[PDB]
Amino acid sequence: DLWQTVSRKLSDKKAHKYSLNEIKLFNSTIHAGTQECKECLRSDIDISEDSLCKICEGIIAISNDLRDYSFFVVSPEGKVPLPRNRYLSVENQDGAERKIKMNKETRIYSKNQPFVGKQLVTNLWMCDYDFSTLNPETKKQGIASYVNREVGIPRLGVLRADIDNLGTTFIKGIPEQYRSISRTATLSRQLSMF
RNA sequence: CGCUUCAGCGUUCUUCGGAAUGUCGCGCAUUGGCA
Numbered sequence: 001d002l003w004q005t006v007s008r009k010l011s012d013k014k015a016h017k018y019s020l021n022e023i024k025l026f027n028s029t030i031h032a033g034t035q036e037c038k039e040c041l042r043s044d045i046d047i048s049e050d051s052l053c054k055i056c057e058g059i060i061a062i063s064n065d066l067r068d069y070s071f072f073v074v075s076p077e078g079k080v081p082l083p084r085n086r087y088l089s090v091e092n093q094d095g096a097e098r099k100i101k102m103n104k105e106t107r108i109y110s111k112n113q114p115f116v117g118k119q120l121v122t123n124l125w126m127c128d129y130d131f132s133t134l135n136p137e138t139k140k141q142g143i144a145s146y147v148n149r150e151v152g153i154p155r156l157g158v159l160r161a162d163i164d165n166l167g168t169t170f171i172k173g174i175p176e177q178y179r180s181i182s183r184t185a186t187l188s189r190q191l192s193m194f
Numbered sequence: 195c196g197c198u199u200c201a202g203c204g205u206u207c208u209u210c211g212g213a214a215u216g217u218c219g220c221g222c223a224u225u226g227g228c229a
Contacts, residue, residue, distance in 0.1 A: 140228060144226095144227055156227095
C-alpha cells in the first residue's frame with residue numbers, strides 16, 4: 001500500500017506538472033523563427049543547414065557510436081546534452097580514460113561489461129545486436145544485407161513484442177505475504193537482464 | 195393354266211483410360227537503408 005500512495009502523488013504531480021512562472025515562460029517567446037527542425041518541429045532552437053536541430057543532430061550522430069563503442073561518457077562537452085550542463089558521448093575504452101583525466105567528476109558508464117576491475121564506472125545494460133555490423137562491408141549495406149538471399153523471397157521481417165500485463169503482473173507477480181522490498185527489486189532486475 | 199403366303203427377323207447402339215501439367219506468382223524507380 002505504501003507504493004500505491006507514492007504513485008497516486010506521482011500521478012497527481014503529473015496532473016499539475018508546471019508552475020505559473022513556467023507557464024508564462026512558454027508564451028513569452030518573442031519570435032517564432034523562419035525555419036524549423038524536421039524531427040523536433042521546433043523553430044526556437046538553432047537550426048543547421050541540414051535542417052536538424054542542435055539536440056536532434058547529436059541524437060542521429062550518437063546512434064552510430066553507441067553500437068560500436070561500449071563506454072558511455074558523461075563529459076562536459078559532447079554530442080547529446082545531459083543535465084547539470086553536461087553532455088553524453090560514446091567513446092572507446094581508451095577514449096573513456098582520456099575523458100576522465102580531462103575533467104573532474106566525469107561519470108563513465110560501461111555497456112554489457114561484466115568485469116568489475118575497472119573503477120569509476122557503473123555497468124549499464126543495453127541490447128545492441130546487429131548482424132550487419134559484424135562485417136565492415138556488410139555494415140555499409142545495413143538492413144539491405146538481410147534481404148540479400150541466395151534463395152527465398154527478399155523481405156524484411158519486423159517484430160514488435162510486449163510482455164503481457166507486466167504492469168498488472170508486477171503488482172500481482174508475488175503474493176502479499178511473499179512481497180518485500182528485496183523481493184520486487186529482484187523481479188525488476190531479472191526482467192531487465194533478459 | 196399358274197396361284198397363294200412370306201419380305202426381313204432376333205441381338206449388340208459404343209466401350210475402356212487420360213480430365214490438364216510444368217514455369218513465372220509481381221519486378222523496378224521514388225519513399226526506406228547506408229553513407
